[PDB]
């Protein structure tokens, strides 16, 4: 009954006050986390402990991935440690961090953990394909930023870029009025 009053467009607590385009995005996202159909009981309980319940999953995912890593801690990729949570939360429906509270809180968690643990998060490898997914750009601008070298190193499916360099290139050249860091501060 709470989700039905929440999907209708009214204020339902503890669920967040979001626009109607985003409230359906959380329901599709919650079906991807449990990898099953939608459960009404665990959905309301998950936002009752917001945001520290969502922080508890990301800690358990990076502890699970690091222990089961098949490559050298320096050869770790972004899809090998945060391939499920990050790529499954970019466009739900879009990158407006004012209303996409999943991507807004995941970038809040990864900002205070960039150069902790000897720079574990900031040294994660990325391609040129999955750099355009985060930066919201094209492969022509990526190939231009290796000519003028704003971005520091072409095979598009090659792992030549680090996550801390892509995260700080976004804070330099790719913010917008909706997708920028000033909402989760």
Instruction: Give every CB contact of residue 46 below 8 A, 6+ residues apart in sequence.
Output: 30, 53, 54
Residue 172 binds another protein, judged by CB under 8 A: yes
Q: Do the beta carbons of residue 130 and residue 81 sit within 8 Å?
A: no
137 contributes a contact to another protein by CB under 8 A: yes
Contact pick of 5, 17, 49, 176 for another protein (by CB under 8 A)? 176
Tell me which stretch binds another protein (CB under 8 A): 1-9, 35-43, 45-53, 172-180: 172-180
Instruction: Check residue 114 for interaction with another protein (CB under 8 A).
Output: yes
32 binds another protein (CB under 8 A): no
5 touching another protein, by CB under 8 A: no
Q: Is the Cα torsion angle 81, 116, 177, 175 positive or negative in sign?
A: negative
The first and second tokens of residue 58, run together, are 């990301």
Nearer to another protein, 8 or 168 (CB): 168
Structure tokens at 91: 């466009």
- DSSP run (H or E) holding 125: strand 125-126
Measured CA to CA in angstroms, residue 12 lies from 8, 23, 134, 167, 168 at distances of 10, 11, 32, 34, 37
Q: What whole-number distance in Å separates Cα of residue 100 and Cα of residue 26?
A: 9
Question: Is 115 an interacting residue with respect to another protein (CB under 8 A)?
Answer: yes
Considering only residues 71-90, where is the footprint of another protein by CB under 8 A? 71-73, 75
As a whole number of angstroms, the distance between CA 20 and CA 17 comes to: 9
Q: Does 140 bind another protein (CB under 8 A)?
A: no
Q: Is 173 in the site for another protein (CB under 8 A)?
A: yes
Q: For residue 65, which of 51, 84, 46, 52 has the smallest C-alpha distance?
A: 84
Size of the site for another protein (CB under 8 A): 38
Exactly one of 111, 132, 144, 160 binds another protein (CB under 8 A); which one? Answer: 111
Of the candidate spans 38-46, 49-57, 125-133, 147-155, the one that interacts with another protein by CB under 8 A turns out to be 147-155
Interface residue list for another protein (CB under 8 A): 19, 21, 67-68, 70-73, 75, 93-94, 111-112, 114-115, 137, 141, 148-152, 164-165, 168-169, 171-177, 180-183, 185
């Amino acid at each position: 009954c709470t989700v039905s009053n929440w999907l209708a467009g009214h204020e339902s607590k503890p669920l967040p006050n979001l626009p109607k385009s985003y409230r359906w995005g959380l329901v599709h996202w919650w079906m991807g986390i449990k990898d099953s159909e939608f459960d009404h009981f665990s959905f309301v309980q998950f936002f009752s402990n917001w945001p520290r319940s969502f922080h508890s999953i990301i800690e358990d995912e990076v502890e699970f991935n690091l222990e089961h890593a098949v490559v050298s801690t320096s050869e770790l990729r972004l899809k090998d440690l945060l391939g499920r949570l990050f790529f499954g939360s970019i466009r739900l429906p879009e990158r407006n961090l004012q209303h996409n509270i999943i991507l807004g809180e995941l970038l809040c968690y990864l900002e205070n953990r960039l150069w902790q643990d000897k720079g574990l998060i900031a040294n994660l490898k990325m391609n040129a394909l999955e750099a355009t997914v985060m930066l919201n750009c094209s492969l022509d601008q990526i190939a231009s930023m290796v000519e003028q070298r704003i971005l520091k190193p072409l095979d598009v499916t090659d792992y030549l870029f680090h996550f801390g360099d892509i995260f700080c290139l976004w804070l330099a050249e790719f913010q917008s009025d909706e997708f920028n860091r000033s909402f989760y501060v």
